[PDB]
Amino acid sequence: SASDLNRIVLEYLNKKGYHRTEAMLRAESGRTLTPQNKQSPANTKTGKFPEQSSIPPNPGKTAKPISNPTPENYIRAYSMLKNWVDSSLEIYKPELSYIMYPIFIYLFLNLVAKNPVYARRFFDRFSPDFKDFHGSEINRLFSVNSIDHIKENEVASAFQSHKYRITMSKTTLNLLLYFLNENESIGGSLIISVINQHLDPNIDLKLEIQKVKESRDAIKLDNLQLALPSVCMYTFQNTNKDMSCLDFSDDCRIAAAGFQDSYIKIWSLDGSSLNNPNIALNNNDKDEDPTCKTLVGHSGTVYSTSFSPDNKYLLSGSEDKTVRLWSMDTHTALVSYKGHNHPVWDVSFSPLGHYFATASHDQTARLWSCDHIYPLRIFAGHLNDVDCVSFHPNGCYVFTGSSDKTCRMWDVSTGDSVRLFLGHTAPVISIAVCPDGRWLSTGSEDGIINVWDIGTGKRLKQMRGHGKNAIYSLSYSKEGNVLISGGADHTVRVWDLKKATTEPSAEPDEGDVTASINQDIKEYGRRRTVIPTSDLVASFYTKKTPVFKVKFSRSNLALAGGAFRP
C-alpha cells in the first residue's frame, strides 16, 4: 500500500502546483541524507556565539539541509586573555603580568576610534588592577574619549608612532600564539591583529603564525573512536514509591526530586550547608537542617522538574494545573504559570534559558516565557497527549513526543509542525537531539530507541537492547555521538550511533569470547528473549533500583539517578 501512497503523493503535488521537474527534484532532495557539517558543535576556532540582540528566534533566512556545505567586541576578547593569564600562579605568571598592559592600552586606543561608550566600559572595567604598577598614566588617560582627544594626549598620539617594544622568550611567545590560535573567533584573531600591527616583539611574524597554524594542523584527531563512560549513580533510599522523576543541576551541586505528596525535595550533592547564609548570620540554628530543603507550593503531584542553565532557578510542573518557579538561593516560590487545564508532565527550559516548553495531557504542547504568566505558542496536532518535550540545541525548534507512537518538530515562531516522525510502536517517553543537530533520537515504552535524521525525516536505524519496558531518560556525549540510555529495566546502556550509517566512526583494526554467546545461551526461548543490535556495547545494571535520570557531564563522566525501590 506504499506504491498507492506514492501515487497519492504525486497527484497531490500535481494538483497543489509543483512542476514535473520541480516535483522530481523535490523527491530527489527528500531522499538523500543530511550531509556532514564539519563545524558540528561549532568548534571554537571557526564557531561564533549567538547574538544577544533582544529579538525572538526565527528559522527563516535559511537554505535546505540537503545542499552540501555550511562585531565581536573588545571587552570579551580581552577578558578571555585576562582570565587565561589570571588562572595561573605558575612559573609563567609574571611574564603575563608584564605583557598584559600594552595589549589593553592598544585595544583601548583602537576602540576609542570606533565606539566611545564601549571604550568607557572597557577602560573602567580593567582600571584599578595595575594603577600602582603603571603610575599616573591611566589618570592621564582619563581625558581621552574621542578621535580628537587622542591628539591632546601626546603619549597616546605617540603610541601610533612608537611601537611598544617587549622582549619575550620563545616559550612564552609560542604559548601565546598557540593559545590565540586554538580559539580565533572568540577574539583570538582580534588580539593577534593588534599584536601583529602595533607591537614590537623581540626574540617577520606572519610566517610565524603560518608555521603555528601548519604545525597545529599537522596533528589532530580526524575520525574519533568510542569511549566508555564512567557512571556515578545516586540512589535515594527512603522513598516509599512516592518519588517521581528527578533532575541534577549543572556543576552537579543540587538535586531536585518531585514527590507524590506535593513537595520538591532539594539535596546538596556535596553535603554542603544549602542555607545561603550571607555572612550576617542572624539567628535560627534551632531548626534542623539535614543539608536538604523542602519546597511546598504545589497542590498536586509533581510530575516533572527542570533546572535552568543559569542553575539559580527551578521549574516544577505538577498535576495541579500550574508550573511554578523557585529561587534556588532563598528557597521560595516566585511565579505561578497557569495556561493548562490538564496535568503537566514535562517542563524543559531553553538552551539559552530564554523560554521554556511544556507537555500536558490536553494533547498540546505550550511555549512560554519566564517573564509572561500565560503562554506564547500552542503546539497542537498530536492525536494523543504529549509525554516528552525538548528543544533543538539552538533554541529554534521544539521536539514533542506523544502517546500515539509518533513525535513532531515544531517551528517556534509560526507554531506549525515542520516534521512528523513515524515508525514507533509504543508511547514515545524520552526524546533527545544530538549536539550536531542533524540526528534525532528517542525511546519508547517498547524498549526500542531509534534515530532519524531531520532532513530526510526517515529512519537511519534503531536500537534493540533494552527490555520490553520503558526508557525513562536519554543523554548524549558532549563531543561526538555516544548515547546513554537509563531505563526501567534497572540498566544504563551505551550506544554507538555511527555503526550502520555512512559514517563508521573509526572501528578498531583487529575478537572476544563473551561476544555473541551471551544472547546465544537463550535458555528462556528465542521468541521470549531480546536480541541486541550491533550498536549496543555495554550495559551497567543497578541491582533492583531503577534509573530515572541520566545526565552526561562535560568530562566523560555521566551521572545516573534513581530511587531504591523496595
Binding site: 564512567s230 556515578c232 533510599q237 550533592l269 556535596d270 553535603g271
Partner: protein, 54 residues
C-alpha cells in the same frame, strides 16, 4: 615489593599504587546507610538514659 616492581618496569617499556587500569576514584560526599541506624539506636538508648521521660 622488590620482585613485582622489576617485572612491572620491564613490562612498561614495550597495596600497589601504580596499576593504572584498576583504580576507582573518590567521591566528595556519599550518603549514610549504616551509621544512621546505630545512631538512631543509641539515640533511643539516650532517650532511655534521660531518667525515664518520654
Amino acid at each position: 615489593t622488590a620482585k613485582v616492581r622489576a617485572e612491572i618496569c620491564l613490562k612498561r617499556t614495550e597495596l600497589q599504587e601504580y596499576d593504572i587500569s584498576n583504580a576507582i576514584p573518590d567521591i566528595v560526599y556519599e550518603g549514610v546507610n549504616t551509621k544512621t541506624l546505630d545512631k538512631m539506636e543509641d539515640a533511643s538508648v539516650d532517650r532511655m538514659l534521660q531518667n525515664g521521660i518520654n
